[PDB]
Design a protein around this ligand. Structure first.
Ligand code: FAD
Ligand code: FAD
Lengths: 533, 533
């Protein structure tokens, strides 16, 4: 409804944390710049993923922008880990303060883009038939999206109230008096279920694969601590930029294999009581050594058995057969304790898979469960899912989707050869999802917008990764992943392992500070490994 | 070039073992019937997969047709496990004997099919613009196909001779005097490499994931044994139909967890010396128990260490971290022994991934390898890959591809609700690939063609799976797989595991004889769970 321009220096796709700061920084650099966004307003995942209990897994004081001193001083975070509604208020504040919505077209989806060698510009199409010409195209389209899979058979026949964590109602849902089922126990399930358990007459949790989760120990943020922080906030964030994960997480010196059982328990118990994801770096080899991971995993398995009263239920909740911490660590608030309530029932759908959703509830091989309400607590698509929905055509009319079918091929995760003037923010080939996202997002946005300012300053109009450096980068990302446990998790690859065909690991796991040094050296040498004309 | 008919009772897609016997049996039942095949002649995988060393992993006397007494008496198998060229001669003989090519259109690919409720017929299109109307559609399109993945970067710049195991030249390739590289050590790599090692000046084997393989102990077939067999061949094959795997494999009574190390070694060593895949049923829980698999796996790991002289090379060849025998067991002929030759070199591409194919050879992170010839020893697509290349549209114009995106949904693996008059031979939801394929193929073809004869006999024209029985079957297949180790192998699922979304295991693992009883009871009760009109 705000009409997009016919021509612009830079077109940004997406208005979450990434896209908003791209828009802002490009305005400040003196460029013309516009955003296209599917949703009705700003916030990205914090706008669309609004189920009760949705909460960030990184501390509030770390998971924020640092580019504006006034923002840092004006915003008052209220809790140790911020809720989705509070994050969304923060993002809306940033957008209101800097008048960013004047540069955004909402309710609009980019459907295709192709590059014109004659003009060195992209022509971009949308689902309202807009056609936009942009010199540069910035994909701020995110890592998480709705999976592209049919639902459980029979879902549409359910006769009660049906809710999706991925599209939760805007007004609050009261489950008082109700028999409620939750299907899925990844991130959304673990976060939403204890909130539902507070209200429901009965809650059935349908679990397929059990996931690891550790206690949040969420707490109000001491105002006095926040005031001290604000006096040195800039020094604090420059410390965060100088770590492997983009936060103040203590780095664990010892091997988990070298301590006595006694020392291990004493160390891991301190982390369990403190809460949060810092336990991932309790020891140095948790993600490097099969035996060392299994040790830390076993302690967490025992905490689950200690918490849940019924030993048979406890054992069903115990994750088995796959490594700990090779995905972002889920923080839980009374999720294990929940199973001690008399009105909460775990249904193990590995023993008895779901046969069908029925008008009455859920049928497995053992029995029907009658429900008044059903909640689908869905997981997420592959990290490349959003991008693959757009028909992106580069040199030779080649589809990005075809080129990246064995895994995303990029130079520094920022650009791909054959697709000039196209940049990816916090996506594949970079630290992205395995680090404090806001630290990664700001580093990318600064690098890409500074690069784009350099082009205009030097009279250049086309920027493209060199094919050889892209091949070297992909190989380098594989080589360092192959020294870790991350490759045991199939979901970091696109498609199955096939002899005689390449396979690309999704992300750079060498550490944020290392990655940043690499990018800074590339920029300082005049964009070594890009071809600028 | 033989023109396909305008209208037929049954159209068969594919002219391998499955399609040829469908064609034959439908002719004998008095129906009109025609085949469409991409290749220039018969044989399916035995026609297109023709690299040196390609060989069946099931004994010759078991891996053959049994529907013709004259075929059984006339054919003389020469070896314990038959080579691809010998299998292809057998299939060409069957086709020559029964004049089957008069019913086949070669060089032609089916591209789309849609169902017409008004006529109860399929209309099928091909890539030569043929349009065929068929009452019934039989997919004999196979389990193995070319993977849909980009090649290694730089492959097209290789300046030497480039060979693909999936499309090997028709005239013999002489590697004498040459430096040769093989990339891929699944089935094709393990079979082709020792043949190349006999001729090459130097051979580099580029291994990513090491696979398990056991010795074939191939040997000529004693003519006197074959003569005795032929006098009771019918009794012998009825014994084969009465087993879990469709062969005479001894079924192992004991747990691998209950014997002394001593008894284990003595038992497994006898199997190692006898050769072949019967070791899979040495004990009863090899595929049921994590600890019991790991025990049998460790013995095989030690055989590898015993065979290969250089302990460092041996350890790189040792498969680690995934279970033994959850895929079809590869039989090797001097593959481990090959690494003891002075002209054979293993390159571990987990430590040093391939960066690029170069005009000279292969570059990894450590070094370039100069080669005169490069062989890509490719793996295979998902089992659903062939079917997904055809635009199949059922009731409501729904795409089979969309319906099966979380995994193939079928009743008995034969048919899917919403796609009437369509049958799958030896595909998902049945024993198919985890059993002697010829036993499975003949059971399916007999069941489907008898079903089709019943329809015509009773004046019926539309056959469709009942949605409820399809849901029950899918659930049943998941439930019995979930009691085994098969689900640890990601490749039996289509796409990643996603919370809140269904996941279907590809195959029925309950045993061939059990599956056959199920199908026979369904037919005996008038096709219970199909809707016939
Ligand atoms: C419950 C939960 C907990 C989390 N915890 C953490 C944590 O502890 N640490 C961490 O780093 N991250 C966490 N995250 C992740 C969060 O995704 C990232 O930190 C960050 O918010 C990503 O922002 P973005 O702007 O890059 O992408 P997004 O927020 O995904 O925004 C992308 C936007 O692009 C739009 N878009 C996509 N395609 C198109 C198109 N074709 N046309 C128009 N618009 C399009 C989408 O609609 C969306 O609004 C969590 C996320 C959730 C849901
Ligand atoms: C090296 C090797 C070893 C093997 N060892 C064993 C073993 O030990 N045991 C076992 O059971 N199996 C084994 N097999 C597997 C073998 O695939 C099956 O046993 C059997 O041959 C399958 O026959 P089919 O007729 O169903 O399919 P296929 O032989 O795959 O024939 C399908 C045909 O359909 C054609 N087709 C596909 N789509 C279309 C279309 N759109 N239009 C026209 N034509 C189309 C293809 O071109 C192909 O010719 C092995 C295979 C190989 C390659």
């Amino acid at each position: 409804r705000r009409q997009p321009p016919e021509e612009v220096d830079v077109l940004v796709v997406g208005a979450g944390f990434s896209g908003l700061y791209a828009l802002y920084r490009l305005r400040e650099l003196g460029r013309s710049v516009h955003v296209i966004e599917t949703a009705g307003d700003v916030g990205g995942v914090w706008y669309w993923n609004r189920y009760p209990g949705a909460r960030c897994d990184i501390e509030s004081i770390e998971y924020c922008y640092s580019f504006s001193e006034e923002v840092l001083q004006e915003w008052n975070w209220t809790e140790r880990y911020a809720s989705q509604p509070e994050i969304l208020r923060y993002i809306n504040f940033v957008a209101d303060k800097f008048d960013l919505r004047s540069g955004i077209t909402f309710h609009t989806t980019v459907t295709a883009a192709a590059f014109d060698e004659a003009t060195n510009t992209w022509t971009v199409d949308t689902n309202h038939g807009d056609r936009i010409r942009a010199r540069y195209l910035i994909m701020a389209s995110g890592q998480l999206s709705v999976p592209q899979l049919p639902n459980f058979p029979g879902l549409k026949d359910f006769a009660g109230n049906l809710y999706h964590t991925g599209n939760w109602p805007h007004e609050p849902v009261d489950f008082s008096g109700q028999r409620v089922g939750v299907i899925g126990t990844g991130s959304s399930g673990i976060q939403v279920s204890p909130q539902i358990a507070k209200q429901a007459a009965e809650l059935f949790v349908f679990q397929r694969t059990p996931h690891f989760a550790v206690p949040a120990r969420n707490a109000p943020l001491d105002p006095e601590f926040l005031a001290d922080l604000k006096k040195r906030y800039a020094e604090f964030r420059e410390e965060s930029r100088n770590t492997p994960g983009g936060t103040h997480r203590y780095q664990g010196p010892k091997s988990a294999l070298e301590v006595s059982d006694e020392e291990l328990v004493e160390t891991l118990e301190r982390y369990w009581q403190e809460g949060g994801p810092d336990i991932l770096a309790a020891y140095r080899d948790i993600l490097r050594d099969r035996d060392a991971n299994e040790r830390v995993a076993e302690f967490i398995r025992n905490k689950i058995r200690n918490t849940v009263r019924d030993p048979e239920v406890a054992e069903r909740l115990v994750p088995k057969g796959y490594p700990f911490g090779t995905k972002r660590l889920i923080l839980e608030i009374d999720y294990y304790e929940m199973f001690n309530r008399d009105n909460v029932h775990l249904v193990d759908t590995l023993s008895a898979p779901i046969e069908t959703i029925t008008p009455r509830g859920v049928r497995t091989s053992e029995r029907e469960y009658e429900l008044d309400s059903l909640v689908l607590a869905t997981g997420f698509d592959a990290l490349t899912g959003a991008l693959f929905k757009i028909d992106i055509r580069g040199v030779g009319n080649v589809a990005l989707k075809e080129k990246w079918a064995a895994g995303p091929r990029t130079y520094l995760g920022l650009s791909t050869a054959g697709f000039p003037n196209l940049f990816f923010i916090a996506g594949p080939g970079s630290p992205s999802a395995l680090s404090n996202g806001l630290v990664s997002i700001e580093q990318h946005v600064e690098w890409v917008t500074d690069h784009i300012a350099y082009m205009f300053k030097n009279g250049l109009t086309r920027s493209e990764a060199v094919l050889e450096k892209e091949d070297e980068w992909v190989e380098h990302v594989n080589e360092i992943a192959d020294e870790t446990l991350y490759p045991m998790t199939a979901s970091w690859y696109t498609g199955a392992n096939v002899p005689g065909k390449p396979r690309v690991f999704m992300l750079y796991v060498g550490g944020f500070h290392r990655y940043r040094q690499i990018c800074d050296e590339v920029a300082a040498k005049g964009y070594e490994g890009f071809v600028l004309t």
